[PDB]
Amino acid sequence: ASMGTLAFDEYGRPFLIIKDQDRKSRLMGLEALKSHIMAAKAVANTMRTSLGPNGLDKMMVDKDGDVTVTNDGATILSMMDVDHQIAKLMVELSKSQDDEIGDGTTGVVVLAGALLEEAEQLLDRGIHPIRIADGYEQAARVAIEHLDKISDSVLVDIKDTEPLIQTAKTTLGSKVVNSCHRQMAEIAVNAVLTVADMERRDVDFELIKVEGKVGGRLEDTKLIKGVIVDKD
Amino acid sequence: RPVLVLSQNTKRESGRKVQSGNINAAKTIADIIRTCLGPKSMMKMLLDPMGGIVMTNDGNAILREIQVQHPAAKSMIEISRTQDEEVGDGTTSVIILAGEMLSVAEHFLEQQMHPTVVISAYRKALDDMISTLKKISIPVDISDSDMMLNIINSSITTKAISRWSSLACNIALDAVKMVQFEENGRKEIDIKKYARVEKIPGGIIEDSCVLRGVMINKDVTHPRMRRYIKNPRIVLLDSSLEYKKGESQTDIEITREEDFTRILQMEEEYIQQLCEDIIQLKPDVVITEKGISDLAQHYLMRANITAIRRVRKTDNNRIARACGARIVSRPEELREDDVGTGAGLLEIKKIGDEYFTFITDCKDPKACTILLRGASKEILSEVERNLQDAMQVCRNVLLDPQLVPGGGASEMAVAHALTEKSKAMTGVEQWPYRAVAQALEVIPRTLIQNCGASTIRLLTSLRAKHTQENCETWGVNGETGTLVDMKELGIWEPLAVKLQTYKTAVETAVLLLRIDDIVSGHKKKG
Amino acid sequence: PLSVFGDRSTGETIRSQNVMAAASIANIVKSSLGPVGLDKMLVDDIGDVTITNDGATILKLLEVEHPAAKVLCELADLQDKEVGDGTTSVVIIAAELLKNADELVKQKIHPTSVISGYRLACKEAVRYINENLIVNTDELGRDCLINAAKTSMSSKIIGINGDFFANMVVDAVLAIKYTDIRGQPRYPVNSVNILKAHGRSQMESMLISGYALNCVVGSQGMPKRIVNAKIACLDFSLQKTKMKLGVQVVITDPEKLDQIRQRESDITKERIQKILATGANVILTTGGIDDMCLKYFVEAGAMAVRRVLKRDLKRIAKASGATILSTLANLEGEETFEAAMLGQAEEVVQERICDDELILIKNTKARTSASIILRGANDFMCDEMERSLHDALCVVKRVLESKSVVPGGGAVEAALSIYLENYATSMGSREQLAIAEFARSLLVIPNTLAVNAAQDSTDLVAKLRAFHNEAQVNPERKNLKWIGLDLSNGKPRDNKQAGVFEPTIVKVKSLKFATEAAITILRIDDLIKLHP
Amino acid sequence: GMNKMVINHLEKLFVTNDAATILRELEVQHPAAKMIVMASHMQEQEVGDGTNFVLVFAGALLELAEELLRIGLSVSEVIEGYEIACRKAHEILPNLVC
Amino acid sequence: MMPTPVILLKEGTDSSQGIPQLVSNISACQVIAEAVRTTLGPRGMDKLIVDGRGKATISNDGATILKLLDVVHPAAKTLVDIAKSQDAEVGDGTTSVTLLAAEFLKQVKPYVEEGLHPQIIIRAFRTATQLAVNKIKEIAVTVKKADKVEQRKLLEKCAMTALSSKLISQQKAFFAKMVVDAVMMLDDLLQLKMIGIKKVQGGALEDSQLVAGVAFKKTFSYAGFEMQPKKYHNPKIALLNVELELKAEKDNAEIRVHTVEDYQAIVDAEWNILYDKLEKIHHSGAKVVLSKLPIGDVATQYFADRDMFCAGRVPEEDLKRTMMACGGSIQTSVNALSADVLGRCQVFEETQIGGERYNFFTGCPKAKTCTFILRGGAEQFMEETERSLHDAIMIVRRAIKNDSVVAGGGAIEMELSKYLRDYSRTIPGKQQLLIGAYAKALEIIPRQLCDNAGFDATNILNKLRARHAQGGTWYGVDINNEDIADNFEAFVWEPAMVRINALTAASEAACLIVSVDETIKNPRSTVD
């Protein structure tokens, strides 16, 4: 069940097929799926405590001893030193969510963990995993259609930023800057609205410079309609 | 953690490789001693792992001193030992014959012939070999001592003792003749037990003789006893002549002051009673396999009796056979018939720096000793081996009075007979038949090679001679390398030796041809 | 998850591993089957050499660490113990059954169906053998026993010499026949002593019309030949008498010490005289004899043998009519030996066999015994000759006990394969496939026989199958059931006419045992191997 | 003939029944076998086919030479006989052209 | 054996010959086939292989799995080689070739164990394979109408069948439509380098798009790039191979002056050379400037001042695709920038795609190239999507070459097995057994399909055999309904050349494996 196959032939003469076959490992069939589901469940259960306004940060320490206290799911999984391949798949999923959207990088991991956890008990009852995947795809289509149905539209005009401010506040609610919550949402909305092509076109993040400097207070963070240069 | 259906140290080899390896191993064993055959053979030096030196040209000794790893070589060694034990001669011949038959069998195995066919052909060949050997034999009058001496000579012309031919022949013949014994309607010779060979380094080989009695490396227990008795009456014993503890636990308890002295006096009285019982038969010599007490020695010297102690059981049996005595264990049951009368002289004399006891004038002795005097221990060991071969040949002739021409004449005659017989089979096994028949030519070929003459010319001439009608006794002269009639040269061999050699060689070839798998390395699992 | 300190294999992996192990064991001995089989040479890593063809011996000498291979090895051992022949065939059949059953399982056939099919096929094969493929030995006579012995000794070192060895085996077996209660003639093989001594060729092997002892007389003074022997068998040592553990000698008056010491040996002297006063000539004892009693026997001119093996002594006593006497004590409390307790023989000698000596008890009375002295070229040859001779003796015993024999040379397997292939179509839906695969597996024996001869195995087996199909289809061609394989010419041949017979019990027991082993191994689907 | 899988010292597969290729990919160490291989390669260079013939004929000649040496003939006589027979064979060969 | 004081071959040489080594070779082939056994069919499962460096490759492609496996068995390497051969010549069926070869060897293993001469087996395989290929060519369905709608539908169905075994099988209709469109708009040689495959992390599979033009990633813009307009409505594209930056005039050039006016003149001359190149580019009327060589900051600012767009260090393949789509010519010199050598596209735009910026050239009416932009959640996700799309593209190209289709799902092989059994029932009988074994081996694919789907393979095989015997050429395994169906009517279509090449390669591999009798393995050199 492990290490692959080992017979050394029925005639006693050596029977070697793959280089270093005695040093390699092999998992097959249902127990491989169970191991993968267990690893993904572990990752998702680790991440799920940092979900929502009452989420708790994770204190990440890299190989050099530098400390990164953070709540972002993609950052946490990126700095996590994993060796399991399914954990790497979880990390890549978080990175994908961060790149495409930028928010919800923790919800994807919890959702994937829940889906695999349910698929475990489905597999225990003798359902082919491809059937589970097909059912998941069907239900995902239904859920996406329902989201489109129950969705609501907001105005993205520059003369009324209240819905935009509310959305930014909701995004920031789970972060440590919730003390300066409204100011942070205000500056983020103004920054995006200032540098953007109004015909629903792209927003060039290269035109937004995020600069940090120690000292002062967190409330001193401000949006500057210009450039702050590190020179004199 | 490998699966390991078989053990890790188990190795398997199979196929043509196994057969080729077995046949090559047999050929190598043959080549070791190929040159040690014939009158012109050369001796070999064998270094004993214990530090000794064995210098010989006997085939069995050479093969016995060699350690080998290939199991086919072990089989060949066992074949040599079997031939030596069964008849005592023809060891080199049987080894060479087995090697040659295995070679000619490999010839067919290389082609698409199954080994069973070769084995069946070999067995048919062996049957015809036996038939022809019995056919070409001649009878022998065992009464004629000259013919027996000639046979022993022909046996020992190829050994280092051949320089002293008449002496060795007479020694062997006399020893066998006076060890021959018959009782209760059963006849026996028993060269192994009686007819002891005792070698004393020094002197000259011409002084070697077989005594009409036995000789042991023993001396009188007390110097006052006579060392030269004319017509002794010998009494043999096993039990010690000394006070001994009983079998059961026999603790004593002494409370009276005079019991200790009494007990010691009873010990002395017991010794005196045993000695008196022995003396009652009026003997002159007392031999014991165990100790003799000093007080017993005194009591025996009081009666003028020579006493020898701590004699080996084999030596004591030999003495009993020689002097017509019977070993007894309880002196109180000693009878007149047990007293050994028949020894005509007993003499203890010094040889070199050591005493030797001689009982050497027995009338009609059924046991004997052979006193070998020579240059050193190795020379005497080789002389003993040659004389053992001579005695074995003499015994074989005495049991079976058939003779067979030597010098390779019998080999060529049998080969020609089998070749002529093979012309009528017209089957598929005729070829192995003819091959194993012509494999017998390795004996005359080896004789010619050792002699140094041209092999091809002499074998061609010999085959042409044997193609005639009355030429079964034509062989190869071992010295001049010429074709001579063996009824003129006089070299003859016992039929038993030839039969045993042929049988053993053919059967070895059959046994080794039968194997095609080798597995090794497994545990003993005793 | 499990946290078991060991390795685990599950599913197709363990099944294929077991099949591989069984196939390796079968391939080890597959080359030593049939008349064109060849022996092997085993080296025991200390120089010991064993040359053999017997499957059981090869499998016992080999050290094996895979338990399925161990199952096959013990299968061979069981077949040897219960039958004595067919030890290689049962192993090969079991391995082929396992191979084909595993193929069926890999085809998603449930192993329970395969096991049920195998059970049905084995039952039907035994029934068909008993109903159609048996030949009674009543209408054949001694020729049947001779042919069975010759067939058994084929593929052995004594195969070519069957014309002589079969006569020897049959005479030895018939010489020990005894009838018990219920009037059942039973033949106690292993009562034939087999002695090995190198020397002359195989033709000089001797069949003793009596018993042969691997012992010599204890003293050179005793005679080595007695004409009218009166054998006395004893089970107690004849030595100086020593008191038991609970008895201790304590001396207060010294005058009694000499009497004590004298009586210590006078007791044994009196026992010897009591035994000898009845006219005894030969005395055999399992215990030892010291020099004093040896001289007592010497003076009387009587042969005395010590350290005789207990089984040899029992056989000698039974054959000669003597009685084992562990002690001399009658029911009157006295110590006596009566002449009625003595066996008799027509001659007892000490012959010389290749520089050694052994005692021959020739022509015992009140029962006939037998022993065989095997003469070979060396020790290995004699050992293999003994093994082959034992196989032949067991085969003759089976034939004489159960008077049914079956044609050899693969005839039974071919007939069974045809019959089972036809019969499977009337049973089940998947056990049908199992029975078909059982029938196909039964054909490994003729295939191996043909292959060992370097013959065209495919065409020869096809011709055999065609002959047996014609026999089973045409009611008037039933005489073709006996067509087997003639390996000398590589052609089908009427083996019953050719005299290639063998006991029915061999095939029946081999089939049953192979089915059991295949069912046992096929049941496994998971292996846990704890670390030592 | 049956193809042979030959793996040289560099894990380069050579499945072929060409005698010259098999010899080239075999690490022959014995000097006499080396000379036989060199003769085979010379035949391959000169003609292009017949290398296996070269090995078979040379091997048969050498085994029969060993037989002749064993029965008694000297090396020189065997060599002279082989040379004479080779000359006779070369003389005969043109007459066998079909 | 014996030590042989001077040994023939080098010490350590391993030799194996006879039946046992052939049986071992067959067993090794079985082991290799087992590695890709479960990857076959719509119910097939992927395999994950990790190299020594730690990178993980997740694939359903048989050739990829075999390549990632580091096989060193001499006989087992033949199956990897035939998988590569099938991938190269056809592009699909790399699992079928290995399964068929292993099944051939397994079927003939019992006969090999009986000592049957391998030449007979080889001849039987050759005869059976020739007959099977002829039958495939004979019964393959082709339509001699050259109807555009029918041809498009056939290509779409073949692409869907080639796609309904991979992780993108849920969007198989979508991706089949894309692949068919791309191959049809390829011009005449169907060069694979003319179909760009861009993988961008993030986004659903349905977010993947096919560009009717060319698209490539942003290439290391310099300062002043963000001032260039990022959308044009009818740009003219200048495809250049020119380094537009101040630099040494030549590597071995060396300037010698002895006067300050000459120094200033040399400096102004370098500047004037650069500005002359830039003015020549600008006066051509082009608005988008693409170069294979670096474009400096000075040139970037110069183009920004003119409302122009520049992008240096464009990969060569991307410039070739841009040339084939917009329709210009790559110029190593700017001295003759005429309207002939200028590309033209309807719309150029730079847009963000999942944290990356891409340049889009759309609206090309006579484009001979495409650009697949694939979205997904992981690097291996996009890699396997690309592999599946490559399989589909190769199938569509081959179907473009010849529209000869055979129904899949094991129907073609069941028909071939029936035909071969019928043929074998009418020959002497030594070859009959081997041809029957070949026909039985041709049943591995439907059996493997049923086994992977979790069916009962025996019942489906019996039903298929009965159906083919009583009539019906295109009845195969119906995975969804756990039954059999007319797979031709279910649009389970396969180009005939796929099965033809599969049978040819499997037969050749089996013949080569059987033909070998001895394996010789020389000792390693420089083990280090």
Ligand SMILES: Nc1ncnc2c1ncn2[C@@H]1O[C@H](COP(=O)(O)OP(=O)(O)O)[C@@H](O)[C@H]1O
């Ligand atoms: N004078 C002789 N001339 C020729 N041949 C002889 C002579 N004496 C002995 N032989 C041959 O030499 C052989 C004896 O060789 P030997 O060394 O005794 O070998 P082994 O010890 O094995 O018998 C015999 O076969 C015999 O025929």
Ligand SMILES: Nc1ncnc2c1ncn2[C@@H]1O[C@H](COP(=O)(O)OP(=O)(O)O)[C@@H](O)[C@H]1O
């Ligand atoms: N003379 C013969 N001709 C053909 N077949 C034979 C002959 N003698 C024996 N056989 C067959 O050879 C098979 C193998 O026997 P063998 O392997 O020697 O016995 P075991 O199985 O006890 O080792 C037996 O099944 C027998 O039927």
Ligand SMILES: Nc1ncnc2c1ncn2[C@@H]1O[C@H](COP(=O)(O)OP(=O)(O)O)[C@@H](O)[C@H]1O
């Ligand atoms: N819809 C389908 N229904 C049944 N079988 C299918 C279907 N689509 C593909 N197949 C089968 O899948 C087999 C090939 O498996 P796949 O993994 O797609 O390609 P490859 O042969 O390259 O592994 C083909 O023999 C085909 O018959």
Ligand SMILES: [Mg+2]
């Ligand atoms: Mg959030």
Ligand SMILES: [Mg+2]
């Ligand atoms: Mg001699």
Ligand SMILES: [Mg+2]
């Ligand atoms: Mg048997």
Ligand SMILES: [Mg+2]
């Ligand atoms: Mg050629």
Ligand SMILES: [Mg+2]
């Ligand atoms: Mg495919």
